Amino acid sequence: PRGSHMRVLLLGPPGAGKGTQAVKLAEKLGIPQISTGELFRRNIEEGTKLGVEAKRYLDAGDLVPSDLTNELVDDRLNNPDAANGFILDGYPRSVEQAKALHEMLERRGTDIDAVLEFRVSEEVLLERLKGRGRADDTDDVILNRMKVYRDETAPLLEYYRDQLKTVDAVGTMDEVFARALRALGK
Ligand SMILES: Nc1ncnc2c1ncn2[C@@H]1O[C@H](COP(=O)(O)OP(=O)(O)O)[C@@H](O)[C@H]1O
Ligand SMILES: Nc1ncnc2c1ncn2[C@@H]1O[C@H](COP(=O)(O)OP(=O)(O)O)[C@@H](O)[C@H]1O
Ligand SMILES: [Mg+2]
């Protein structure tokens, strides 16, 4: 047994349960969870200049351009709360963001420890998103987000192939939590 100070990526399509498990893992491991969707939504609700520009992209299910997202994650990781590890939820979502992340962490003398892919069939995703009812959880937006995932984000499974663990993310919250912990060796 080696300690809990880890840097974990959760990768997976919209609805895979990433936000859900990131909160549970953050509590268990004693490290913050960081959601790029959450940070954009806060910017939007405080009406920042970033919020104003990001909203067109969030509303449509598109990714916010990478220059804005990379800068935002770089800034968040400057918080001393993230100094002994973190769980990232929804970033990186493209190979460009993965290379940008590598640079950010290298500057700070560290790197990613583990990468968990939340594997969930599309039928399950749809039922979950329809039950969630967030603003972007509509049929046309969900379709776009799925294409976004396939086109931009799914290539990360190959990029992180050496660190990747796939989790059967269909089951109870407790079931999936235990599976994610086994994947982390915890
Ligand atoms: N194991 C699970 N079983 C059933 N529903 C779940 C499970 N995990 C999460 N959910 C629910 O499904 C929806 C999507 O979960 P969420 O964690 O927001 O996914 P993501 O962050 O991957 O888009 C939420 O309404 C959430 O409460
Ligand atoms: N890494 C990212 N790069 C670009 N845009 C992002 C990123 N993360 C989140 N966003 C924007 O925020 C939206 C909501 O993200 P998220 O909360 O992660 O959705 P979900 O919880 O369903 O996985 C995304 O559809 C996108 O418009
Ligand atoms: Mg989420």
UniProtKB/Swiss-Prot annotation:
AMP binds at T36, R41, D62, L63, V64, G90, Y91, P92, R93, Q97, R134, R145. Consists of three domains, a large central CORE domain and two small peripheral domains, NMPbind and LID, which undergo movements during catalysis. The LID domain closes over the site of phosphoryl transfer upon ATP binding. Assembling and dissambling the active center during each catalytic cycle provides an effective means to prevent ATP hydrolysis. The LID domain is a solvent-exposed domain that is much shorter in Mycobacterium than in many other bacteria like E.coli. Catalyzes the reversible transfer of the terminal phosphate group between ATP and AMP. Plays an important role in cellular energy homeostasis and in adenine nucleotide metabolism. Has a broad specificity for nucleoside triphosphates, being highly active with ATP or dATP as phosphate donors, and less active with GTP or UTP. There is a cross-link at K99 (Isoglutamyl lysine isopeptide (Lys-Gln) (interchain with Q-Cter in protein Pup)). Monomer. One of its GO terms (biological process) is nucleoside triphosphate metabolic process. Its EC number is 2.7.4.3. Residues 131-137 are annotated as: LID. Its main location: cytoplasm. The keyword Transmembrane does not apply. It is found in: Cytoplasm. PANTHER family: NUCLEOTIDE KINASE. Belongs to the adenylate kinase family. One of its GO terms (molecular function) is nucleoside diphosphate kinase activity. Keywords: ATP-binding, Cytoplasm, Isopeptide bond, Kinase, Nucleotide biosynthesis, Nucleotide-binding, Transferase, Ubl conjugation. ATP binds at G15, A16, G17, K18, G19, T20, R132, G171. It catalyses: AMP + ATP = 2 ADP. This is Adenylate kinase.
